[PDB]
């Protein structure tokens, strides 16, 4: 599923991401844009046996277990497959575990490099929520 930005913003807010650890909602929508381009089925293999899954591209070496990654930690205690649904619940839940403090969004490279420093609020203005 490819979310529209407003549609995704409303969902993330309903799931408690608006101002989570002090991160305004736009940061999460912006992160999704650059990580998965809003595609809930987005998948991407990296040089290391790691693969990132879902709207927020959760990593299989540290956060979710996919079974094909050496050195898996599975810190979110969840199957990577569980993160490829139209329902963003599992991905947000894992995202909330990843961001344990006010600097946590650095967990997403795209966010640090393409969202931080930009008007992330622009991704949500005009969205009914």
């Amino acid at each position: 599923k490819v979310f529209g930005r407003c549609e995704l913003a409303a969902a993330m807010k309903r799931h408690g991401l608006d101002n989570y650890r002090g991160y305004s909602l736009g940061n999460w929508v912006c992160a999704a844009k650059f990580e998965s381009n809003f595609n809930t089925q987005a998948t991407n293999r990296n040089t290391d046996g790691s693969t990132d899954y879902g709207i927020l591209q959760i990593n299989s070496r540290w956060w979710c277990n996919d079974g094909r990654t050496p050195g898996s930690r599975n810190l979110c205690n969840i199957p990577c497959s569980a993160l490829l649904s139209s329902d963003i619940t599992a991905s947000v839940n894992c995202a909330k575990k990843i961001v344990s403090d006010g600097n946590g969004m650095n967990a997403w490279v795209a966010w640090r490099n393409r969202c931080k420093g930009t008007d992330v609020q622009a991704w949500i203005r005009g969205c009914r929520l």
Partner: antibody
Amino acid sequence: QVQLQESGPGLVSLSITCTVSGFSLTGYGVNWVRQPPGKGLEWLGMIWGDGNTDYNSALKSRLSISKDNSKSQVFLKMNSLHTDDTARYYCARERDYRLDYWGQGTTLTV
Amino acid sequence: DIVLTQSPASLSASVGETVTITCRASGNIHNYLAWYQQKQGKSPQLLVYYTTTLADGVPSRFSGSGSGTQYSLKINSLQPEDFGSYYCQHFSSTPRTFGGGTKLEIK
């Protein structure tokens, strides 16, 4: 250790410098705010981490904000100075829609 | 542009008392409202952001609330260090603006 310090002409095309440290200008916005003697705060404008700028609607034609990421400096330029521009000028770091650290400011008299 | 109307202009109160400052915006600012405190001869300092979140180190007696176009800052059992000035500021899109300020002074 996040710090910001204004540097200005003192009296006067105006030119004030905001020297920062403790963070990268590529990751945060820097706002310019002024406060006339014994008055309230007035927003002047800002330069986002990505270089974009926005200005006070009424003062836009007289303001120019720019920066040099490599020297951790942000600049405020204001021309057509008038008595009404006399005030303390502040630069402040914006972190995700709140000005979290402010410089001590620098007083200017036109 | 969005304009903020802050009231009252001043407040005379005594330590222990509870006071409320309001800030209403001519347009919906979607909770993007912050509050700052400013002591005489000092730079403004962040107190609350995104309507209800206290900045690090700010005592819990400070509480912010609001939504849409109306907001307020409340100080329960205000203390000596609370006296000084307060300003609200919105962050809804760019032309940002501040409220007119409130001087909280000792009764």
